[PDB]
Amino acid sequence: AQNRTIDGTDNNLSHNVWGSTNQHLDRAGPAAYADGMSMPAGGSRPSARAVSNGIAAQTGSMLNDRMLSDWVWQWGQFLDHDLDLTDAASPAESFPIPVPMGDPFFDPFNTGTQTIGLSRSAYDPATGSVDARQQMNQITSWIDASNVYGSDMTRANALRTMSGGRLATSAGDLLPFNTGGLPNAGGTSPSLFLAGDVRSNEQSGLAAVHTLFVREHNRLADQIAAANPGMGDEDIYQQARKIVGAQMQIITYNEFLPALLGSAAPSPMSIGYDDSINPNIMNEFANACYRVGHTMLSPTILRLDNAGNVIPHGNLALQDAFFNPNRIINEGGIAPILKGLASQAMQEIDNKIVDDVRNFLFGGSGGLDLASLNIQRGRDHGLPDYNSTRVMMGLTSVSSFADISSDPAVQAALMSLYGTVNDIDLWVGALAEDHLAGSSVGELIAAVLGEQFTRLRDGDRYWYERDDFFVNNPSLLAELQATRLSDIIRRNSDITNIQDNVFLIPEPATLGLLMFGAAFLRK
Ligand code: HEM
Ligand SMILES: [Ca+2]
Ligand SMILES: [Ca+2]
Ligand SMILES: [Mg+2]
């Protein structure tokens, strides 16, 4: 059958570049650069770090109220790494975040001169001088498992064995090592994993789900070859790839979005192929509204055995999970994490980000604040303010801080940071909204996510329901439709006791009762 390109071209048969690598991020409406060119938006607002301090600071654990597991954010990130990537422009354009004088984490010597580093995002070089700067998406916009296969044929080929349609692995059926020194977040070291997306080593949970899908690909490839001998490597590879790409769509629209968006989730079925849809990820989605992962993040990733015990090498502190393959290689493999993610409730969706990523220090000595980066990134990308974005999406504009949040502490923080509802950073406003009834997000986030996911459903010629391969093999289409993330976890690991919907935490008594007779209580 027809197969997707690796680069996302030739999906839309008129604008063939649409959805492909290196396309512009779309915009919902006009950019808000101060000068209409490249000068950052939000130049009247406080420091991104002052905003982080004033509204994202979290002193205690705050569980979500909809029973959602850590799988919601882990899938969210994995799927993000299928949708969009924008690295730094080169030559580097520095746009540092001023640290408030006396900031207890980043300026404890009261210098008044500390910054958090940020280089401005890559953009189309034909933009940003005489017209608005348009940032580039460096992976395929399509939900096509480019996070497994790569977004260029060179990397895609590097990931393959070229025998039996398979993807390379390392010892213990783990991701292959980057021995060829291809581009990779964390650098070109051969001791880092190589996956379809360059960010796979970012943290161990991400790496674990990347590994899972390499396992699933190889299972499919082996079984296809077994059932259909005489088929060549290329044919087996493309068939397994097409099944895995369909799985990404099915899990995303049937499990993840219903979990996160709830009442606001878009239909999991396409209304039909609309080739007029721009599938290029929207800047305001990629670089604000879909960055709702950071507020969900838990301080620890649980690592559990089949009895629900913490494994001997302990749970994994989020900070210990960054750019370190050994957490998987030497501390129990992927199975404990896959189970663990299903077994803990994520943090609430709100302005608050855990200290583990808001105040990640490397040694005073500098470090990482994901809240500050997100805020500055939205100013780098010329994103419209929160309220303008509401109007861009056909929502009413707010006219008071009470219109944003019914929490008086959130109201007060927004007031004392911004002074007017019309100059709030999109990411901050979006996360400040009261949640829709039956949802874990507010109206703006619902609308922006709803829009993006509607486009990628109806705008993709290889949306799985209309791929000739699945149309011509209805039994496979049906088996795909009945496939959940838990099924993939189970058949590619040694996990025996996991709930069928890994996006929802299990009944409170589950771990205790499974532990009975085998409980390890010293962890
Ligand atoms: C441990 C978990 C996570 C880590 C460590 C992490 C880290 C990062 C970092 C460092 C960036 C770049 C920040 C910047 O300089 O602008 C980023 C970007 C992003 N993150 Fe997160 N993130 C996590 C979870 C999530 C989740 C759960 C989601 C979505 C549900 C998400 C969505 C995004 C998106 C959309 C971007 C922009 C991606 C691009 O287009 O380049 N992240 N993440
Ligand atoms: Ca993709
Ligand atoms: Ca939170
Ligand atoms: Mg070949």
Numbering used by the authors: 1 to 363, 366 to 525
Paper text:
Although CyanoPOX shares relatively low sequence identity (37 %) with bovine lactoperoxidase, it displays comparable biochemical properties. Except for a highly similar overall structure, CyanoPOX also has a conserved active site pocket when compared with mammalian lactoperoxidases.
The crystal structure of CyanoPOX with a bound heme cofactor was determined at 1.67 Å resolution in the monoclinic space group P21 with one molecule in the asymmetric unit. Also, CyanoPOX in the crystal structure seems monomeric, with a size of 55×50×44 Å. Unlike eukaryotic peroxidases, CyanoPOX lacks disulfide bridges and N‐glycosylation sites. A non‐covalently bound b‐type heme cofactor is situated in the central core of the CyanoPOX structure. On the proximal heme site the conserved residues, His294, Leu372, Asn376 and Arg291 are situated. His81 is identified as the distal heme ligand. One of the propionate chains of the heme has salt bridges with the side chains of Arg291 and Arg379. The covalent bonds with the methyl groups of the heme observed in mammalian peroxidases to Asp80 and Glu202 (CyanoPOX numbering), through two ester bonds between OD2‐Asp and heme atom CMD, and OE2‐Glu and heme atom CMB, are absent, but the residues nevertheless remain. A conserved calcium ion is observed on the distal site of the heme (11 Å to His81). Another non‐conserved calcium ion (10 Å to His294) is liganded by the sidechain of Asp350, the carbonyl oxygen and OG1 of Thr295 (adjacent to His294), the carbonyl oxygens of Glu348 and Lys352, and two water molecules.
